[PDB]
């Protein structure tokens, strides 16, 4: 198609010029290869201190903001990423914020997976690894916050998606038609249509083998906002029972009467 | 909320 197959190689622009890290770079740090030197794993609190030196209160609630800085990262760039969808600009003021409410957290999780292996993911863009073992071994709640991700990274990294894959799925994810509020439930739905489509049609154009990716995918959708739901439920434990984590105020903002 | 809507307004 002319604009089918236009429109996914614009919306994978505005993917690798507004993300990086990407997947592409992620798998380059991983599996060895042209580069040597890997990155420094954290997998005890002695070495979490040496990572933390070189950076410039308990242990739990420092990983915590650590993690609230790549988030507000991570949004203010869904923001930008989300202008460039065609359609997206032209929406209401307020149906612009609700997509990207309901819709950051969901993509944040997604992406996330790429630089995550069953044994770790990478932090501070690639120079570093964090063992999954040693998020376990935190106290709870924060032992059970990043758990649930690498569950859902394993089965949704099966799929072996590439970065133009993903940017469409992400695209996606924030064209969703059913969030709560939304006012042009129309305009919206149509515009998810288009992005769904272009989707539907790459998947069965890059992985002509994988006849059911596009249903899979559907599904992870599903599992990404039931895991966004307990996220933000554990999310209020931790803003309501440990008294030394603050909640960032561009974070506390979305969450704000979010499910 | 004021931000986000402070940065769509870009």
């Known amino acids: 198609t002319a604009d089918l197959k236009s429109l996914a190689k614009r919306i994978y622009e505005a993917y690798l010029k507004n ?116 998020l376990k071994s935190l106290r709870k709640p924060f032992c059970d916050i990043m758990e649930p991700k690498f569950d859902f990274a394993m089965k949704f990294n099966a799929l072996e998606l590439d970065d133009s894959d993903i940017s469409l799925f992400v695209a996606a994810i924030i064209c969703c038609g059913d969030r709560p509020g939304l006012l042009n439930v129309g305009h919206i739905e149509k515009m998810q249509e288009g992005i769904v489509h272009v989707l539907r049609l790459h998947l069965q154009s890059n992985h002509p083998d994988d006849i059911f990716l596009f249903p899979k995918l559907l599904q992870k959708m599903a599992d990404l906002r039931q895991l966004v739901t307990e996220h933000a439920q554990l999310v209020q434990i931790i803003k309501k029972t440990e008294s030394d984590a603050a909640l960032h105020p561009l974070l506390q903002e979305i969450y704000r009467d979010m499910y | 909320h004021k931000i986000l809507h402070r940065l769509l307004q870009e």
């Open chain 1, 19 to 134: 993300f990086n890290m990407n997947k592409v770079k992620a798998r380059v740090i991983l599996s060895g290869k042209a580069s040597n030197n890997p990155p420094f794993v954290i997998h005890d609190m002695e070495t979490l201190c040496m990572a933390e030196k070189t950076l410039v209160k308990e242990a739990e609630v420092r990983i915590f903001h650590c993690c609230q800085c790549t988030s507000v990262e991570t949004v203010t760039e869904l923001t930008e990423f989300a202008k460039a969808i065609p359609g997206f600009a032209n929406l209401d003021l307020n149906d612009q914020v609700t997509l990207l409410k309901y819709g950051v957290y969901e993509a944040i999780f997604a992406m996330l997976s790429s630089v995550m292996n069953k044994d770790g993911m990478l932090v501070a863009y690639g120079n570093g690894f964090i063992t999954r073992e040693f």
